[PDB]
């Protein structure tokens, strides 16, 4: 028994298979002008394509669609990195495995290919994410719970200078309440399900803070490709 709201939000989910083919397609199409970028430089490229994808998801999504562009910007500027992290995390739970990271383009990559050439900062970050991904496998995190977390993340009540604030709270309390019902109806013998889900939010917020600092560092160290979206987001 999936509540009313969750079904609505559940329909705003992009075509997962389609997005992989497209981002993969762009990475290739892009490749055509250097007789070149490193592994990192490529991951960056893949990440900000994931960003374009996310913005479209929010832009034509129930509720978000009704905010003035100024509000829309304030909310996304506040949770972009956490949306990307949640996205990557949900992908590892649904598709990931053991000692292998599932990229957005659709391919698995043994952890060692990543681990081999990783520094101190990136190591702490990849480890924190690992802990979180595992905590969620442990809770049997599903898609219904996933989209709820996304909206609770998007429609944050910590963003200031918001005009239509009254609508943010509406969905916040509304999605909150939907999730509260969903978990008690689909998982009665596990009354802690709700709480554990809500407590991942602070973790997703932290990992995303770290990921931005680490990415700013890489950009200051001249490791990031000329003006990608992510860096243009960090500038704010």
């Amino acid at each position: 028994s999936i509540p009313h709201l969750i079904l609505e939000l559940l329909k705003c989910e992009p075509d997962e298979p389609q997005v992989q083919a497209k981002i993969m397609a762009y990475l290739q199409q892009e490749q055509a002008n250097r007789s070149k970028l490193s592994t990192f430089g490529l991951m960056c490229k893949m990440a900000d394509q994931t960003l374009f994808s996310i913005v479209e998801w929010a832009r034509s999504s129930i509720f978000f669609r009704e905010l003035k562009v100024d509000d829309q910007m304030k909310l996304l500027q506040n949770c972009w990195s956490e949306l990307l992290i949640l996205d990557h995390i949900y992908r590892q739970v649904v598709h990931g495995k053991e000692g292998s990271i599932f990229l957005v383009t659709g391919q698995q990559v043994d952890y060692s290919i990543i681990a081999s050439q990783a520094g101190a900062t990136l190591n702490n970050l990849m480890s924190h994410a690992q802990e979180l991904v595992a905590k969620l496998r442990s809770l049997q995190f599903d898609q219904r719970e996933f989209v709820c977390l996304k909206f609770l993340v998007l429609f944050s009540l910590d963003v200031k200078n918001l005009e239509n604030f009254q609508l943010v709270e509406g969905v916040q309390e509304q999605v909150n309440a939907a999730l509260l019902d969903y978990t008690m109806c689909n998982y009665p013998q596990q009354t802690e399900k709700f709480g554990q889900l809500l407590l991942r939010l602070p973790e997703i917020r932290a990992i995303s803070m770290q990921a931005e600092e680490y990415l700013y560092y890489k950009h200051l160290n001249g490791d990031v490709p000329y003006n990608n979206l992510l860096i243009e987001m960090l500038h704010a």
Partner: peptide, 11 residues
């Protein structure tokens, strides 16, 4: 943030 505005206003 011009780019973000662009992505939301675009097409």
């Amino acid at each position: 943030n011009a780019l973000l505005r662009y992505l939301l206003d675009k097409d």
